[model samples]
Target: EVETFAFQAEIAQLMSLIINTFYSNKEIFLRELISNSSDALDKIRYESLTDPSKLDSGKELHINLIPNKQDRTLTIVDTGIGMTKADLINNLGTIAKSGTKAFMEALQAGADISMIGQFGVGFYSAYLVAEKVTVITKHNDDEQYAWESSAGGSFTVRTDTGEPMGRGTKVILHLKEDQTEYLEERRIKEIVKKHSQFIGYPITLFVEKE
Candidate 1:
């Protein structure tokens, strides 16, 4: 069933805070996106150890940062375990309940500062610079699907038929009016290096051909 749903009251408040506050450095958005991609790849790699079929033999895990100058869009794609329909709904729809909540709880209980932003509602960090966000993902046992939201309380999901992702997720961020700096190759590279340079997978930045 294709439809839209609103974020929980508390979740909605958290999103507003991220977009309005929480961020003193705007570029941290790229760092959070890349980190999330790494986590997805790690999950698949761990599963593949016991179930070889979890990942195709020799399937390389990598992340791609594609920036469209003309369209003002920043796309982060990863070859990892994509989300199922239910997974998408539960992960993106609600708040402080899944991994994000657990991360917050750990912090409250005095977890290490080194892993502060490892996970949490870091996905909402995208809204700090994007007016809208679109996520396209394909899971091994589910059809490809697209999820779109404006960082508001509501989001919509629909089946996608363009092309198979071969098991992964792509996040497209529509740059906000004053956030065009995110589309710059040098800026993105710097951000990636600062926060995700040590991540396990490869991260490639895409530049437009003249």
Candidate 2:
């Protein structure tokens, strides 16, 4: 089913707020994404306790961090329920799915709501350090799909034929020149442990040393 969706105006404002203002720490993006992955893993585990067959039952719930300094790319791969193509567009391109309403509400009420997990705007955080961001995802119910964005007004989605990751999503951050620190083993590992220690999932990094 081919479909397109748009973002609400206020949500776009909120997205701009995130991309332009206060969020200065580009290094912690992996931590945020992995935290979301951990949440997804938690969701699947809770669901599996009863239904047992909602999706692929064999895929392990975890997050993997792979850094490729040669390509200036750092990938955060997860073995969690992946999104469909339409899901990719709506989740990544538009701001509607970002949970901006909740965020705004929290702000208005003077509540500390940083951990709200707004996926739509959350993905754009990659733009802080990357020239291009690519997302490839495979779900039990849908064909594998790929999404790419350079943090501009639009993103592209296409069919994916990459080697099977079984079930889940992979995010490739094509790092900008100034963002090379993200490709470092010690720095990346330190950030992971610092932010995601309580994430309740195994956050593993493929450390490469020269």
lDDT, candidate 1, equals 0.80
TM for every model, in the order presented, reads 0.87, 0.80
Best lDDT among the predictions, by candidate number: 1
What does candidate 1's lDDT look like per residue over 1-210, in tens digits?
A: 678978776567656766775445777778888888888899889899899988872388999999998998999999988888887887542345464566656768885323435556678778888989999998887888999888678889999886778988999999998899888888888888787879988888988975
Local distance difference test, per candidate? 0.80, 0.71
Candidate RMSDs in order: 3.3, 3.6
Off by over 4 Å in 2: 1-19, 54-57, 92-98, 101-120
Give stretches of model 1 more than 4 Å off.
93-95, 98-119
Q: Judged by TM-score, which candidate is best?
A: 1
Q: Give per-residue CA lDDT, model 2, range 128-165, as digits (tens).
A: 67778888887767788888766445566778777776
